Every structure is written in structure tokens, then in C-alpha cells.
Design a protein around this ligand. Structure first.
Ligand SMILES: CCCCCCCCCCO[C@@H]1O[C@H](CO)[C@@H](O[C@H]2O[C@H](CO)[C@@H](O)[C@H](O)[C@H]2O)[C@H](O)[C@H]1O
Ligand SMILES: CCCCCCCCCCO[C@@H]1O[C@H](CO)[C@@H](O[C@H]2O[C@H](CO)[C@@H](O)[C@H](O)[C@H]2O)[C@H](O)[C@H]1O
Ligand SMILES: CCCCCCCCCCO[C@@H]1O[C@H](CO)[C@@H](O[C@H]2O[C@H](CO)[C@@H](O)[C@H](O)[C@H]2O)[C@H](O)[C@H]1O
Ligand SMILES: [F-]
Ligand SMILES: [F-]
Ligand SMILES: [F-]
Ligand SMILES: [F-]
Ligand code: NA
Lengths: 124, 96, 125, 96
């Protein structure tokens, strides 16, 4: 039950952030909706920094780890919205941007996770 | 805030029994455009057909010579909030 | 904005809770391609695809229900961040074949499930 | 429920001044194994070094002949709950 609160509090903050950023920005560039990209890139950055930080602090409460990863990063990022955007582009005959969206989300999200991990490792 | 309705609907070429139309695409992911046409005197059934989202022209055939026609165009498009939905139409009249 | 916020939170909390239960229960069974994280992304792809086809045919339904299913449930259920650390960890461990396989199966798999969701409902209608 | 500690740590080959060790990998994504070694009589500094996650053997060199050594192996690994963390060690004694 205490673990469930961490997932819900963290998850609700993430989903709410994703909802605000997507509705505000996605329509600016429909070929690669920037709200959905930013939330995935940002979640990649946070999980990467968590990767390096939690290693160095093995005695942190599992409540805070759960709230940041499964909660916040889980609620903030999205695979389903990434799919419909690409699916819609494929149905619209826009293959060049369907491919570009897949590469930028995947390559971009791994790069942000690498930066998060190595920035904290270089500091510590 | 972004409009999903096309703009500048117009007839770029005409024969007695056909019209070639064009339009500017709206700044959204359009899956297909729906073209409707019918005789402006309203005792005649309106017909429709789709064209792919990549296209911004269409040919209408099998018309009668010397008759006023009403031609409309709307989109089926993807957006974040509404997923797949239909736009409002844009409309013009043209006499063959 | 408050009624819309409830849809996002109720839907999102259900999705996140489902992802939390399925991941902790199953991910450890096959560490090269954690099956809990895969299933939640494939399942969210299926639901968003069925929503895509269904909401088109019922254009005047409440925006509350659309928001709760897509931004809420599918948004909370699926995850890109966990997908990244899994792949990143495999790359750091020198396990390139499974890092590639994880990327292809999540992407190709998730689009296929969205296609099935859309076309099953379109074929029924 | 899944253990991140290696099993069956053992010396498979030995010279007077070196040891080749092996172990079974745990059922988790291991990023690297850390090998530590030092003289069992505790007035001697313990040394460590890593080996890639793909490997399950290591060579220890520059040892003194006829001396008892304590050798341990632990992992740095990925899991869903804890992300990157260190396992408990598995340990053996061996006399050159
Ligand atoms: C990597 C794995 C991915 C798996 C998922 C595959 C994606 C499935 C979506 C298919 O959607 C189709 O897309 C076509 C365009 O791409 C459309 O053609 C439409 O547009 C074409 C021109 O763009 C015309 O030639 C067609 O007649 C017209 O139906 C067609 O209707 C539509 O159903
Ligand atoms: C999991 C498997 C993944 C791969 C599946 C690929 C399937 C693609 C072919 C399916 O058949 C298409 O069905 C569309 C209807 O569903 C038709 O589109 C027509 O109707 C659409 C609107 O319903 C318009 O957007 C199109 O432009 C118009 O051609 C189209 O003619 C027809 O060929
Ligand atoms: C494609 C999109 C972008 C991807 C993101 C960038 C790539 C991710 C970072 C990779 O991290 C490095 O990976 C090396 C290889 O796995 C590791 O080397 C380790 O493994 C090597 C191979 O066994 C050994 O030679 C090295 O000594 C040993 O440090 C190294 O520690 C680790 O920091
Ligand atoms: F998905
Ligand atoms: F996308
Ligand atoms: F991500
Ligand atoms: F993964
Ligand atoms: Na999510």
C-alpha cells in the first residue's frame, strides 16, 4: 500500500506533465510532435541520472526510488502515443517522417539516458 | 488553435463534363480528404469520394454540361487530443 | 480543466499500477528482453489502435472518456524510460545482439499491435 | 526472488604465482564482475579489478608461492526495482 502511493503520486505527476506539454506543443510540428518527443527525452535523462545516482546511494528508501522510476519516469514517458503518431504518418503515406520519428525517439532517448548516467558519474 | 480545414479551394481546369480542383493542405497530419459534389439546385443527390492525404488535387468526372455544381472538401486527420476526427468543410460553386 | 484532470489521473493511476504489478512480477523471468515491460507496451499499442478506429465512428462521444483511455490509461501503462535503461544496460554489458533485438521487437511489435487494434474494429464496422 | 550473486566460484588452474578462476553467471543482466584478492592473513592490502559481463573467468597474477589467498567475486547488475546496484560476494580460500 505504501509502494502503491509512490506509484500513484509519481505517476500522476508524470501523466499530468505529459498532458500539459503535449496539448500545448504537439500541434506546432505535426510531422514529429515535439511535446511527445520532449517528454520521452526528459524521462530518458531522469532515468539515466537515477541509474548513476542510486548506485552510489545503496541505502536510500525504496519508496523514493519507486516514485522516481516507475512513477514519474513511467507516467511522463509514452510508447502508445509514439505508436499512433507513426501509424497515422504511415496511413497518410508520409514514410520519410514515419522513419525519422522512429529513429529520433529511439536514438534520442538512449543518448539522453547516456548523458544522465555519465554526467553524474563524471561529477561523483 | 491549429485549423484542420483546407483553404483556397478552386477549379484550376475544366471540360464540359469534368473539373480539376486544388486546395492548400492544413498544418495537420491529414489521412484522407473527402470531396463532395452535387447540383446546386437541391433536388439532386450529393456524391462523395476520398483522395489520399499526400494529394492536394482531384478530378470530378461524369458531370452534365452547363449546370451549376456545389463542391465541398473536408479532411479526416490525426491530432493529439481528438485522435482521428473529421474537419469542417470548405465550399465553392462552379458552372460547367 | 479540473474534470479533464480527473480523467488523466484516474486513467493514469490505473495504467501505472498495472505496469508496476506486471513488471515486478515478470521482468526477471527473461532478463535479455524483460517480458513485463514488453507486454505493457504491446497491450497499450493494441488499446490505442482500437481507440483510433472506434472514436472515428463515434465522433460526438464525451472527451472525458477519450482522455481517460488514451492520455490516462495507455499513457500510464506504456513506458519509454524503462525501455531505454534496459537497452542501455545491455549496451554497457556488451550484449549487442539483445540490445538490437529489444529495440526492433518493441518498435516493430508496438506498431503491429496498433495496426491490429485499428483494423480489427474497422473490419467489424 | 532471483539471486544476483554468482555461484560455483573455483580455481580451475594454478601455477605457484598465478590462478585461473571461473564461476557460473547469475540469472540477471550483469554489466561487470568485480574480482577482489588478498592474503588471508590480514596485514596485506586487498586489490580489485573488473571483468566484462560476457566473461565468466579471470586470471590473477603476481602472487607469492605457498601463501593462502582469499578470493571474492561480486557483480554490478541491472534489475527492474534497483536499477544498477552491487551484489553480495561469493568467496573462496586457496593456497598457492
Ligand atoms: C514496421 C512495421 C509496421 C507495421 C504497421 C503497418 C502500418 C499499417 C497502416 C496501413 O495504412 C495504409 O496506408 C496506405 C498508405 O501508406 C493507405 O493507402 C492510401 O494512400 C495511398 C497513397 O498514399 C493510395 O495508393 C491508396 O490507394 C490509399 O488507400 C491505406 O489506405 C492505409 O490503410
Ligand atoms: C497488421 C497488418 C499490417 C498491414 C496491413 C496493411 C493494410 C492495407 C490495405 C487494407 O485495405 C485498405 O483499406 C482501407 C480502408 O481501411 C482503404 O482505404 C480507403 O479508405 C480510407 C478511409 O477509410 C482512406 O484513408 C483511403 O485513402 C482509402 O483508399 C484502402 O483502399 C484499402 O486498400
Ligand atoms: C545507439 C544509440 C546511442 C547509444 C548510447 C551510447 C552507448 C552507451 C554507452 C556504452 O557504455 C560503455 O559500453 C562499453 C561496451 O559495452 C563498456 O566497456 C566495457 O566492455 C568492453 C567490451 O567487453 C571492454 O572492452 C571494456 O574494457 C569495458 O569497460 C563501457 O564500460 C561502457 O561505459
Ligand atoms: F505502445
Ligand atoms: F511519433
Ligand atoms: F525515455
Ligand atoms: F528494453
Ligand atoms: Na507512460
Amino acid at each position: 500500500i505504501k509502494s502503491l502511493f509512490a506509484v500513484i503520486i509519481g505517476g500522476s505527476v508524470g501523466c499530468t506533465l505529459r498532458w500539459l506539454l503535449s496539448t500545448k506543443f504537439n500541434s506546432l510540428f505535426p510531422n514529429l510532435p515535439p511535446g511527445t518527443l520532449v517528454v520521452n527525452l526528459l524521462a530518458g535523462l531522469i532515468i539515466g541520472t537515477a541509474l548513476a545516482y542510486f548506485l552510489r546511494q545503496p541505502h536510500l528508501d525504496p519508496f523514493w526510488k519507486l516514485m522516481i522510476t516507475t512513477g514519474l519516469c513511467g507516467g511522463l514517458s509514452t510508447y502508445s502515443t509514439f505508436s499512433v503518431e507513426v501509424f497515422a504518418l504511415l496511413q497518410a503515406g508520409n514514410y520519410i517522417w514515419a522513419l525519422t520519428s522512429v529513429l529520433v525517439h529511439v536514438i534520442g532517448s538512449l543518448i539522453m539516458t547516456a548523458l544522465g548516467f555519465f554526467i553524474i558519474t563524471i561529477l561523483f | 488553435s491549429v485549423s484542420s480545414v483546407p483553404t483556397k479551394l478552386e477549379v484550376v481546369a475544366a471540360t464540359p463534363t469534368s473539373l480539376l480542383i486544388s486546395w492548400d493542405a492544413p498544418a495537420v497530419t491529414v489521412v484522407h480528404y473527402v470531396i463532395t459534389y452535387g447540383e446546386t439546385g437541391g433536388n439532386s443527390p450529393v456524391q462523395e469520394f476520398t483522395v489520399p492525404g499526400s494529394k492536394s488535387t482531384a478530378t470530378i468526372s461524369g458531370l452534365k454540361p452547363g449546370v451549376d455544381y456545389t463542391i465541398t472538401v473536408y479532411t479526416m486527420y490525426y491530432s493529439y487530443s481528438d485522435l482521428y476526427s473529421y474537419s469542417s468543410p470548405i465550399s465553392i460553386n462552379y458552372r460547367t
